[PDB]
Short mmCIF file of C-alpha atoms in Angstrom, two decimals:
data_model
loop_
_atom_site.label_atom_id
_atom_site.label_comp_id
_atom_site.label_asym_id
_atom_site.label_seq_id
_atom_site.Cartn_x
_atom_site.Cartn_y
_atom_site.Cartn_z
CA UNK A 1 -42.93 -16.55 -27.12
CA UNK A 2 -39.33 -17.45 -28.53
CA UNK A 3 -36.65 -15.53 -29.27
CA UNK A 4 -33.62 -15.29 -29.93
CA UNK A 5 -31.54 -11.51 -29.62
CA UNK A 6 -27.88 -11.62 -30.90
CA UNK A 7 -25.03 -9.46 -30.05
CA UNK A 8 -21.49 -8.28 -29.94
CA UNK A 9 -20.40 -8.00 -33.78
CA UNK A 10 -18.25 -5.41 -35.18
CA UNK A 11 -15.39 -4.70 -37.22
CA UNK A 12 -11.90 -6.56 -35.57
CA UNK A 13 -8.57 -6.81 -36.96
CA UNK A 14 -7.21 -10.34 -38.24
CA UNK A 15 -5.75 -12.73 -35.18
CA UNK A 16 -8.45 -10.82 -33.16
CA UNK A 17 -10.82 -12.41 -30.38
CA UNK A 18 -14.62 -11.13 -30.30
CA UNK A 19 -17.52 -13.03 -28.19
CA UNK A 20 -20.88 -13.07 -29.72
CA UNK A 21 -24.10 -13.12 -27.22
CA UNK A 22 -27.54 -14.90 -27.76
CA UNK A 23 -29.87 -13.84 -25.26
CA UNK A 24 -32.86 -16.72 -25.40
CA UNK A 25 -36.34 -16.21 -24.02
CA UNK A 26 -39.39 -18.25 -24.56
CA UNK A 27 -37.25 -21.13 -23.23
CA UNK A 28 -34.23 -22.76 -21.41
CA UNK A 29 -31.34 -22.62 -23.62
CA UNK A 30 -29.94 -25.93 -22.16
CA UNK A 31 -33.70 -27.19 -22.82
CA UNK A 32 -32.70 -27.86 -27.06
CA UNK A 33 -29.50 -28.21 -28.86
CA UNK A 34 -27.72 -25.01 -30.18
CA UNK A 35 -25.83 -23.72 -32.79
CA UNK A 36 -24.20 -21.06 -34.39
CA UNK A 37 -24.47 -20.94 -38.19
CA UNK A 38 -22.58 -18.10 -40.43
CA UNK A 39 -22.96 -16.70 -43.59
CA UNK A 40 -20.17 -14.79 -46.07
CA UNK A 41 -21.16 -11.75 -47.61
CA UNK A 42 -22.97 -13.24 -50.69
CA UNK A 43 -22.44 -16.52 -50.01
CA UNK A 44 -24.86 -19.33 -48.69
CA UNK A 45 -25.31 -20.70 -44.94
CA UNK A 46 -22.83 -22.71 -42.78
CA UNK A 47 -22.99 -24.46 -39.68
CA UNK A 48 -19.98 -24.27 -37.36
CA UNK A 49 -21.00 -25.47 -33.68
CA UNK A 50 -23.34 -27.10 -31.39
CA UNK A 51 -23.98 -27.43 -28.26
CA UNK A 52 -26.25 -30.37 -26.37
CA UNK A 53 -28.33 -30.26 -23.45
CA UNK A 54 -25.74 -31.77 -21.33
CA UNK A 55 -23.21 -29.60 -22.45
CA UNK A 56 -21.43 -31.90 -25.01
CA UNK A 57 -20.01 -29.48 -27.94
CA UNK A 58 -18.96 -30.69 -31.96
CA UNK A 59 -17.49 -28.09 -34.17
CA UNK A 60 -17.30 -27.71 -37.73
CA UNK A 61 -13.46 -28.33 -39.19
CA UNK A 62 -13.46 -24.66 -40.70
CA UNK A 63 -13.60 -23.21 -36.94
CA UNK A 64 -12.04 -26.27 -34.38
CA UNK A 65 -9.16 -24.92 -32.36
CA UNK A 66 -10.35 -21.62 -32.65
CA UNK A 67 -14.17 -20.99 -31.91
CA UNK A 68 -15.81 -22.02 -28.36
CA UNK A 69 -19.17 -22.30 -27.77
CA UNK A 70 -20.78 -22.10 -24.39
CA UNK A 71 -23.80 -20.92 -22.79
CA UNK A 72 -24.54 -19.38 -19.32
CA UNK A 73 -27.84 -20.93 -17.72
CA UNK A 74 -28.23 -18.26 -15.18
CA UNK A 75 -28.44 -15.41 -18.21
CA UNK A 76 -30.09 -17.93 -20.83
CA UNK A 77 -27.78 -16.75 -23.18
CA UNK A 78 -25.78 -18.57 -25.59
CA UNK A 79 -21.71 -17.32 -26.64
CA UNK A 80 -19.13 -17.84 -29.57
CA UNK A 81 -15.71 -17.32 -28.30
CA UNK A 82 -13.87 -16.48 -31.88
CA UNK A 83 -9.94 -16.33 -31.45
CA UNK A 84 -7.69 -16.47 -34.03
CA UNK A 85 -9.75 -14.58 -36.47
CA UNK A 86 -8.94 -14.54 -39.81
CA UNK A 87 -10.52 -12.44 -42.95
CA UNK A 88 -12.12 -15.93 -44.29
CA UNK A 89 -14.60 -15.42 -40.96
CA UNK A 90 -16.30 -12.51 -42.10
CA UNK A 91 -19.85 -13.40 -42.18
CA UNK A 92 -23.14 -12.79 -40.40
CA UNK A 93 -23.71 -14.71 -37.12
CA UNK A 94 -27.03 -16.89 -36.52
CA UNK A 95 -27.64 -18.08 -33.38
CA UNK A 96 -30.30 -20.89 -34.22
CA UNK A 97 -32.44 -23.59 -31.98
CA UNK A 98 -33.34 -26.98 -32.45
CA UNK A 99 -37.10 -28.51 -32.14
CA UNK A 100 -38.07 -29.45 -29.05
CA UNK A 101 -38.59 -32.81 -27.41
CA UNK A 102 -42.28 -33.45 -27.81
CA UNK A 103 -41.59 -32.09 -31.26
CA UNK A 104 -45.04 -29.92 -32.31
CA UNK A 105 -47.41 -29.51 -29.91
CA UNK A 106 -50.35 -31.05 -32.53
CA UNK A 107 -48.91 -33.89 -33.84
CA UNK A 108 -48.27 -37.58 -30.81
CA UNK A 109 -44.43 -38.06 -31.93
CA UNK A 110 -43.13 -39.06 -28.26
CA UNK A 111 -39.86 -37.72 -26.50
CA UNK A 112 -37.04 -37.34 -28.08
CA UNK A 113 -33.97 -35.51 -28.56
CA UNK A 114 -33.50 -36.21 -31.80
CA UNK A 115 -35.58 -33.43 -33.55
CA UNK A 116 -33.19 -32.31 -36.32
CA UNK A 117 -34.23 -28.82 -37.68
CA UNK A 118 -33.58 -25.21 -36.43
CA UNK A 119 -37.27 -23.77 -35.92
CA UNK A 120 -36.17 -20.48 -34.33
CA UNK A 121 -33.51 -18.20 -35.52
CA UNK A 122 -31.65 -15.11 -34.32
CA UNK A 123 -32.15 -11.85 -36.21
CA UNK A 124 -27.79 -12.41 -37.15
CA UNK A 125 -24.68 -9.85 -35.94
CA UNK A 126 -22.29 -9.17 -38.69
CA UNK A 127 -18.47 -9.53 -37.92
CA UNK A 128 -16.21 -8.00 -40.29
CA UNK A 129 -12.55 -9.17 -40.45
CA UNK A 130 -10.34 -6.65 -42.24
CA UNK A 131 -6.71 -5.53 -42.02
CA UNK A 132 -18.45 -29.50 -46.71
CA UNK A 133 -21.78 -28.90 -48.46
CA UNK A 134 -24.79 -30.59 -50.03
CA UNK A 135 -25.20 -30.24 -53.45
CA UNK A 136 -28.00 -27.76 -54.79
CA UNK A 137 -28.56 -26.16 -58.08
CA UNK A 138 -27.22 -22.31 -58.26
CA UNK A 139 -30.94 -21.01 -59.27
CA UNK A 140 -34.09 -22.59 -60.31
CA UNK A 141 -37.32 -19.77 -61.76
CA UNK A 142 -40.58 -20.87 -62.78
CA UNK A 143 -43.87 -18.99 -63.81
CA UNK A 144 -46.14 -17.46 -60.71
CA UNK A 145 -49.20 -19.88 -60.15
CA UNK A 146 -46.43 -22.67 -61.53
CA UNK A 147 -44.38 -25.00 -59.83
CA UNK A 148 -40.53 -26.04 -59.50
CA UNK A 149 -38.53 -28.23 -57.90
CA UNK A 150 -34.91 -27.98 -55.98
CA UNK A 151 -32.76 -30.98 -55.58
CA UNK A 152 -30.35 -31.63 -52.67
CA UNK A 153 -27.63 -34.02 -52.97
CA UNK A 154 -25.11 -35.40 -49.80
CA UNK A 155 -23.95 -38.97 -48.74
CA UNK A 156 -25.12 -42.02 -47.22
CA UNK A 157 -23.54 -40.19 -43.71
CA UNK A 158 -25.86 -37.04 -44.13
CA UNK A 159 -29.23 -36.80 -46.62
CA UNK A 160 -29.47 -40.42 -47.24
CA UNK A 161 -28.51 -41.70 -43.85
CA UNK A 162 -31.08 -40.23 -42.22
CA UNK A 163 -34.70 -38.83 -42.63
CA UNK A 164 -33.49 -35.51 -41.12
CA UNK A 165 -33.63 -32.93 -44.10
CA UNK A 166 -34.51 -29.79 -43.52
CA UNK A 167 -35.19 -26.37 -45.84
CA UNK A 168 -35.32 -23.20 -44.89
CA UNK A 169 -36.62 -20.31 -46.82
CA UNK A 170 -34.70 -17.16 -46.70
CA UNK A 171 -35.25 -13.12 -48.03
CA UNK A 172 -32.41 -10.90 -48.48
CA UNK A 173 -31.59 -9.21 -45.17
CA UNK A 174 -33.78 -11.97 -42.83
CA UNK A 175 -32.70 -14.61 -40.85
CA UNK A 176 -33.56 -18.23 -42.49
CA UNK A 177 -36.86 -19.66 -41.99
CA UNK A 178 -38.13 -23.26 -41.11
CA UNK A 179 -40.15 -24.47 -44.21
CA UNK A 180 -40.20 -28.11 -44.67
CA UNK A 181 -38.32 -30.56 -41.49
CA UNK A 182 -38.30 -34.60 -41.37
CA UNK A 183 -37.72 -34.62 -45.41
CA UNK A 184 -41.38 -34.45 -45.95
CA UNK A 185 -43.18 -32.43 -42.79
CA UNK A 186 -44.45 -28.92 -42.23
CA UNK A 187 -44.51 -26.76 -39.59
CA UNK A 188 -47.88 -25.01 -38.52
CA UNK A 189 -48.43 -22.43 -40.51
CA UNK A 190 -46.15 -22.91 -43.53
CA UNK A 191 -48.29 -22.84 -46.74
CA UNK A 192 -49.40 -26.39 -48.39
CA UNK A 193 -47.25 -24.99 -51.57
CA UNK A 194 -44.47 -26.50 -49.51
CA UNK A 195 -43.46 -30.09 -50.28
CA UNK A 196 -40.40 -32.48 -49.27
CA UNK A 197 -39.16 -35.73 -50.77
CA UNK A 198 -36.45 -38.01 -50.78
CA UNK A 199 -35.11 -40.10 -52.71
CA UNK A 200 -31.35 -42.35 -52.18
CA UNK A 201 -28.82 -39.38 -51.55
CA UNK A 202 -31.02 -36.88 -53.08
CA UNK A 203 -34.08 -34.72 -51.24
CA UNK A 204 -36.59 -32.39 -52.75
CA UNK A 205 -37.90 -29.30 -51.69
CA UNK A 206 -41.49 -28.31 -54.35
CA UNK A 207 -43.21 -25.24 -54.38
CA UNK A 208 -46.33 -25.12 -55.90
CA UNK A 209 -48.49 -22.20 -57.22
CA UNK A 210 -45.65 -19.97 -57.21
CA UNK A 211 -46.25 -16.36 -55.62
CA UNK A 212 -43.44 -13.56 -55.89
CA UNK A 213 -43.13 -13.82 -52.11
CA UNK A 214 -41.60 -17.18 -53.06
CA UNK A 215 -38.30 -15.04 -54.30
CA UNK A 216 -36.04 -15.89 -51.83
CA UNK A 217 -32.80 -18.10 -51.27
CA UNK A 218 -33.23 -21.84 -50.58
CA UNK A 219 -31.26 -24.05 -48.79
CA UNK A 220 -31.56 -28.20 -47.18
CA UNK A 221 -29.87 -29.07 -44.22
CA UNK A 222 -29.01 -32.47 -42.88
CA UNK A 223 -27.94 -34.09 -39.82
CA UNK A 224 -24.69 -36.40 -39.92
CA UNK A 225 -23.19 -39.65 -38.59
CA UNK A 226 -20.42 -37.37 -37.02
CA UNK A 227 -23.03 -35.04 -34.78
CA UNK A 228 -22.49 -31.95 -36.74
CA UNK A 229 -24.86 -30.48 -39.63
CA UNK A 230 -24.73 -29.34 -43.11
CA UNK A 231 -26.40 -26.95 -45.25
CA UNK A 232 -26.36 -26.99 -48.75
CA UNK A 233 -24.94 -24.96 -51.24
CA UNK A 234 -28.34 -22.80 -51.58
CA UNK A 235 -30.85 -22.42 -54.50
CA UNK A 236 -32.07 -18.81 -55.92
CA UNK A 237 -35.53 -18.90 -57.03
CA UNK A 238 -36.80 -16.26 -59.42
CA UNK A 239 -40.61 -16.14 -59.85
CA UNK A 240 -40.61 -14.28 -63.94
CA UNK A 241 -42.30 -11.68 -64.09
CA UNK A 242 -41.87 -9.93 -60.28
CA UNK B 1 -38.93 -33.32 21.70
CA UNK B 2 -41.24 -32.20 18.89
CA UNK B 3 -40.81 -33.68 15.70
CA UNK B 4 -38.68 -31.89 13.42
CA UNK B 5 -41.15 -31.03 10.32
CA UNK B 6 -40.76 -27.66 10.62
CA UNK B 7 -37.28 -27.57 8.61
CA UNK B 8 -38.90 -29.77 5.83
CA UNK B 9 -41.86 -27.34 4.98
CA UNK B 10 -40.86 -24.18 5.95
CA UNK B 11 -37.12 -24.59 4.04
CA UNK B 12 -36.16 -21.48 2.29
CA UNK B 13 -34.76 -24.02 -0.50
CA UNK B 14 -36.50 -27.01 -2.34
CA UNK B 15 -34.40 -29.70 -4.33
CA UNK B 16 -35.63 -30.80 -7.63
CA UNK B 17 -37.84 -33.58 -8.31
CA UNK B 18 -35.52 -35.90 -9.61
CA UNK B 19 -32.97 -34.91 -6.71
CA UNK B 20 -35.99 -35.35 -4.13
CA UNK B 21 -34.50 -34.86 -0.29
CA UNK B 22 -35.52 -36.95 2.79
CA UNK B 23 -35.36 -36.66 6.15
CA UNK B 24 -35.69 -39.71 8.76
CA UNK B 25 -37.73 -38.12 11.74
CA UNK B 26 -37.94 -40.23 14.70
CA UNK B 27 -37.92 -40.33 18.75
CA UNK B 28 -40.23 -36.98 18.92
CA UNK B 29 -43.65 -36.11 19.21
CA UNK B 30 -45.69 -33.83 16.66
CA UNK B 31 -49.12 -32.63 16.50
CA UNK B 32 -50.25 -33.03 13.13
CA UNK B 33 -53.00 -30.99 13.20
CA UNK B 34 -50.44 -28.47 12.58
CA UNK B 35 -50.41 -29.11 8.94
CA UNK B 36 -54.13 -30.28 7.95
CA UNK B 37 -56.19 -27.91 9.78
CA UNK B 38 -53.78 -25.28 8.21
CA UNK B 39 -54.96 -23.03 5.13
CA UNK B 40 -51.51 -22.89 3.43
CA UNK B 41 -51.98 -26.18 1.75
CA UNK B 42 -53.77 -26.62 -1.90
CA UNK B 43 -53.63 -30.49 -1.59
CA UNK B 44 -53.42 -32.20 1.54
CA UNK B 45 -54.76 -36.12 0.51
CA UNK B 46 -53.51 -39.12 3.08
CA UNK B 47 -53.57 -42.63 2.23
CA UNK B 48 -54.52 -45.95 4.23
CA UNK B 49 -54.79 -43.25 7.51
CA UNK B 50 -57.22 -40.47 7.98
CA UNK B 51 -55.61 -36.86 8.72
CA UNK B 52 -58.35 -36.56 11.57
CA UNK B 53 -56.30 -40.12 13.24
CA UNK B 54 -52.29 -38.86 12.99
CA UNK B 55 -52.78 -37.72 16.69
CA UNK B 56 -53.72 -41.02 17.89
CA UNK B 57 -50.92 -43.17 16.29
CA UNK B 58 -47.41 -43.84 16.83
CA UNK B 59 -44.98 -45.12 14.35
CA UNK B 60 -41.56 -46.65 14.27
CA UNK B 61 -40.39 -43.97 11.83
CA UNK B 62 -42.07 -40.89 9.66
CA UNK B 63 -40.06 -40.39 6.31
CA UNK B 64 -40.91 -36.90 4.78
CA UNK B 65 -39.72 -36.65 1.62
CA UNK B 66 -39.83 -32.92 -0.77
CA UNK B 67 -39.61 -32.06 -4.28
CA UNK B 68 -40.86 -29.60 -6.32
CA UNK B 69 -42.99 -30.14 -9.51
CA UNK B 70 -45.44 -28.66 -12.00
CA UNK B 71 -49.17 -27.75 -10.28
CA UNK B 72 -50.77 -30.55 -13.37
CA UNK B 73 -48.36 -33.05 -12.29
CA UNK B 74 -48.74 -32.70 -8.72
CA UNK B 75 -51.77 -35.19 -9.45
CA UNK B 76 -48.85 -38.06 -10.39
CA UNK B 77 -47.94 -38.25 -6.92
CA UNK B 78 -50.07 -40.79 -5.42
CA UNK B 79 -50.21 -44.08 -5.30
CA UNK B 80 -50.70 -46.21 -9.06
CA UNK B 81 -50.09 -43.06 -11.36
CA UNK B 82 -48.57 -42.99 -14.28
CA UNK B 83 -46.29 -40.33 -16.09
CA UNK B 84 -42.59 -38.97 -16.06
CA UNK B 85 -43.06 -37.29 -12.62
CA UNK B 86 -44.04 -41.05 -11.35
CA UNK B 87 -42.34 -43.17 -13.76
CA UNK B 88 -38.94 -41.48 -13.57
CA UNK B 89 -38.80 -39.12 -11.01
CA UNK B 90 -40.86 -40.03 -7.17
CA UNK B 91 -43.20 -43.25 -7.26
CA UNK B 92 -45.50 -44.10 -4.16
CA UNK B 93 -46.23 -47.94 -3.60
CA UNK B 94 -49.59 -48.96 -4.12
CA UNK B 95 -49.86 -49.85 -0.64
CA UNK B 96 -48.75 -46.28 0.60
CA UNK B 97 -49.80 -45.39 4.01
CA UNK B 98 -48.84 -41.66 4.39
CA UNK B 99 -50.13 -38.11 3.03
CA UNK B 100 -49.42 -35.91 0.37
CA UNK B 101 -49.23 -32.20 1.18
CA UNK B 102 -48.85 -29.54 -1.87
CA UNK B 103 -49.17 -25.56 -2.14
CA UNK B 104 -48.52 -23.30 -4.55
CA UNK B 105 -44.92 -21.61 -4.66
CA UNK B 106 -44.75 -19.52 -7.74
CA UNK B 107 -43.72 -16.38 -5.49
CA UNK B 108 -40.53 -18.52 -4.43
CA UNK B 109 -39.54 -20.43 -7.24
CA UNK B 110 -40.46 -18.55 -10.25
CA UNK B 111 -38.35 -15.50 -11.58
CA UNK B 112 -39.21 -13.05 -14.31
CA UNK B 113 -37.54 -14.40 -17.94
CA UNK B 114 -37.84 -17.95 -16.25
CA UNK B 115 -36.47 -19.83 -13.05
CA UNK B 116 -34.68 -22.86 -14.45
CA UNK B 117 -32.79 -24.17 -11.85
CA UNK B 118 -35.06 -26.87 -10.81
CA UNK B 119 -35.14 -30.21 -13.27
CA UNK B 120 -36.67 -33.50 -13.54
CA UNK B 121 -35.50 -36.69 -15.17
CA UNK B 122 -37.28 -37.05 -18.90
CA UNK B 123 -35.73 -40.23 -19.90
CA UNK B 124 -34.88 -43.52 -18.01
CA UNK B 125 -34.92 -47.68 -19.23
CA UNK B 126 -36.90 -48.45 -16.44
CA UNK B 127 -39.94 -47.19 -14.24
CA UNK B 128 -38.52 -46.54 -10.62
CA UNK B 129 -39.52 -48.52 -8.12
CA UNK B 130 -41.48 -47.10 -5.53
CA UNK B 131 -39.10 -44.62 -2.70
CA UNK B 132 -36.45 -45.10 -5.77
CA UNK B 133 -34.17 -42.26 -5.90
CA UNK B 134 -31.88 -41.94 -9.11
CA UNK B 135 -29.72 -38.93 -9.47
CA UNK B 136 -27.29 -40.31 -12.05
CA UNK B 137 -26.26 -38.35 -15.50
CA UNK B 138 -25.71 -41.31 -17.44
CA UNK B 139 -26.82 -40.93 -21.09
CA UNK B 140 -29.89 -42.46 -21.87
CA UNK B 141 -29.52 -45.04 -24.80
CA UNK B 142 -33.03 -44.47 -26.50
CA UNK B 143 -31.99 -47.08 -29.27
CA UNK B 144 -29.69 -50.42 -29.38
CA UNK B 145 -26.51 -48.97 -30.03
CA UNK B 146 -24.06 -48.16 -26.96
CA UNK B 147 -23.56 -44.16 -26.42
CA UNK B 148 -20.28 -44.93 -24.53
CA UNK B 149 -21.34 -41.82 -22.42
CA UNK B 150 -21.49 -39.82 -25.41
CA UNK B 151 -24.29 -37.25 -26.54
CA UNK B 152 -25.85 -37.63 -30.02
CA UNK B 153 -27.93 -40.46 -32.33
CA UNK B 154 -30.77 -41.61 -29.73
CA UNK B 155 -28.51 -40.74 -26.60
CA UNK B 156 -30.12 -38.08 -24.88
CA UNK B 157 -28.96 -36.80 -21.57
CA UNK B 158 -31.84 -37.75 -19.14
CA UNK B 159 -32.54 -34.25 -17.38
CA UNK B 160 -34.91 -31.51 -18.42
CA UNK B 161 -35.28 -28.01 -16.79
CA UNK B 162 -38.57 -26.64 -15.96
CA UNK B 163 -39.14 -23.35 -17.24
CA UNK B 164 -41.08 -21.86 -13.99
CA UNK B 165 -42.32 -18.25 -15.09
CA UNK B 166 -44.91 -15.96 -13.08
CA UNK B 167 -46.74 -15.48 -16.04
CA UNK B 168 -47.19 -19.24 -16.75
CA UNK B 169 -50.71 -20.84 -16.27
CA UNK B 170 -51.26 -22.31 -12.63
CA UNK B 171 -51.08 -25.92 -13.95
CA UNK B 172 -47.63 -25.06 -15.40
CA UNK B 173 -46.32 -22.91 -11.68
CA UNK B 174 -44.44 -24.08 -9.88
CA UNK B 175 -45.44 -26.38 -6.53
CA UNK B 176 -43.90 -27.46 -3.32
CA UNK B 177 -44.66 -30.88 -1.94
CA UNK B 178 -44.32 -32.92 1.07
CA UNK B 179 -45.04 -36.81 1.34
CA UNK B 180 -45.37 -37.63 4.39
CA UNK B 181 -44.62 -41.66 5.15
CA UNK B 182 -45.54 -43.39 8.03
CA UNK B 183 -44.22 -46.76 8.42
CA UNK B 184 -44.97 -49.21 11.00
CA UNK B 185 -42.44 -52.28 11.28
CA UNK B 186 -42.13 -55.02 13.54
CA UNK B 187 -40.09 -52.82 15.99
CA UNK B 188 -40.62 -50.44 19.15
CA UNK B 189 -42.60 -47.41 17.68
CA UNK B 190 -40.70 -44.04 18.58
CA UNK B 191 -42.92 -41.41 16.65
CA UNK B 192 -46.30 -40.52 17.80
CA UNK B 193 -48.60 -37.99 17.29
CA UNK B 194 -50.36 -35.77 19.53
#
């Protein structure tokens, strides 16, 4: 049973320090890469740090020189050391894991540590400071029982370097969920109604037989030539009618 | 001078597979039937010798060597198995003349929320040859391109933990083992059994 338990937010002044805390159970945290992704108030998902089994660390440019992230083995917990705050870093927190490295447990893909989606998520700590990005349309709607499609545009160093793009399906007020990984695969349990593609530069997520539960934000992720990851810009879809 | 076995099996602390400890026991005496007429062992399986014969032998020198591995993988350690435990981690020859001695150690190794202390080597190039130990933390290059000792695209650092919890299913607790190798070269023997 994974999971992933996040705290240590709350309200700091600017050039502030504040650790964050990801208690992990299910598994070893130093058993799969992991990261810390943020989100602004309003604003769509970004990943700012890693950290690999043997203890190897890449940062995103928004947060180097002031953001460390480290883990404790003995307390399975996972830490963002956030110095130098400033009001641009109010967000909410996601501690998030990457697959593991048989992959899924039904499906002969080897050993590997190259399993580039985030398949468990923390529940997210807000921090509150008070005195780049694949290319996705704003929103996309289609009828219910209908489908739609939502493109995601990056480089030849990210999207189309790689078959590593991921989407994640997200509510208001919920962490982001795993819905499509590998550009085209699906994790057990996801509905068929869930489809990947890619294409050159450009992936796409489809969702067929559109239900109102399908009202949610969107967003792709990609692994890069430089180690990091990057989300895209995010998609609204609006089901007409709900 | 009895053999010292004692601080082998009855060590309050085990090394991990991939770190596997031995000790060189020599110039004693030992009665085996110490260890396989006792009821502490789940697997006690020797190889080119009978159990019922270790008190009529002498050798020129007993290695025992200990580890500690998943109960379904205890199975890899025996001569011309196959698998990450044997591939990567402790390989017997196929002309092994010894014993391998195994019992459960959940109560001692497992902790509630996980034990993860003890590891074992997931990736390597090459199958280890047999009494091979490798303890190195080299990245492993999975692909053609040089890591340059650098995580990331197929260069995976080579360890794994195990996560050893007491709820976890008996092939997944954790197990103590003992091989026991007795070698016999063209040289006075100085270990015999009793």
């Amino acid at each position: 049973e994974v999971q992933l338990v996040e705290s240590g937010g709350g309200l700091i002044q600017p050039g502030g320090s504040l650790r964050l805390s990801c208690a992990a159970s299910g598994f070893t945290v130093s058993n799969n890469y992991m990261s810390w992704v943020r989100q602004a108030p309003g604003k769509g998902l970004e990943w700012v740090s890693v950290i690999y089994s043997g203890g190897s660390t890449y940062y995103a440019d928004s947060v180097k020189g002031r953001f460390t992230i480290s883990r404790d083995k003995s307390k399975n917990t996972l830490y963002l050391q956030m110095n130098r705050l400033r009001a641009e870093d109010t967000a909410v927190y996601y501690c998030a894991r990457e697959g593991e490295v048989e992959g899924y447990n039904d499906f002969w893909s080897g050993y590997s540590r190259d399993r580039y989606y985030f398949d468990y998520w923390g529940q997210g700590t807000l921090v509150t400071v008070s005195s780049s990005a694949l290319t996705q349309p704003a929103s996309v709607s289609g009828s219910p029982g209908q489908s739609i499609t939502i493109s995601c545009t990056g480089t030849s160093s990210d999207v189309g370097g790689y078959n590593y793009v991921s989407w994640y399906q997200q509510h208001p007020g919920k962490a982001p969920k795993l819905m499509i990984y590998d550009v085209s695969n699906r994790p057990s349990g996801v509905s068929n109604r869930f489809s990947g593609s890619k294409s050159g530069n450009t992936a796409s997520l489809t969702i067929s037989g559109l239900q109102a539960e399908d009202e949610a934000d969107y967003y792709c992720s990609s692994y890069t030539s430089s180690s990091t990851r990057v989300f895209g810009t995010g998609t609204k879809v609006t089901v007409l009618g709900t | 001078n009895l053999c010292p076995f004692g601080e082998v099996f009855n060590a309050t602390r085990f090394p991990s597979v991939y770190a596997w400890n031995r000790k060189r026991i020599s110039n004693c005496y030992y009665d085996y039937s110490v260890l396989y007429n006792s009821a502490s062992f789940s697997t006690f399986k020797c190889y080119g010798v009978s159990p019922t014969k270790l008190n009529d032998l002498c050798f020129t020198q007993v290695f025992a060597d200990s580890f500690v591995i998943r109960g379904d993988e205890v199975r890899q350690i025996a001569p011309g198995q196959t698998g990450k435990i044997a591939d990567y981690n402790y390989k017997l020859p196929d002309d092994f003349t010894g014993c391998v001695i195994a019992w459960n150690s959940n109560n001692l190794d497992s902790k509630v929320g996980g034990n993860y202390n003890y590891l074992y080597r997931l990736f390597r190039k090459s199958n280890l040859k047999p009494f091979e130990r490798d303890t190195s933390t080299e990245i492993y290059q999975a692909g053609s391109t040089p890591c340059n000792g650098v995580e990331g695209f197929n260069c995976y650092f080579p360890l794994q933990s195990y996560g050893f919890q007491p709820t976890n299913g008996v092939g997944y607790q954790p197990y103590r083992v003992v091989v026991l190798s007795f070698e016999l070269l063209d040289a006075p023997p100085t270990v015999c059994g009793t």
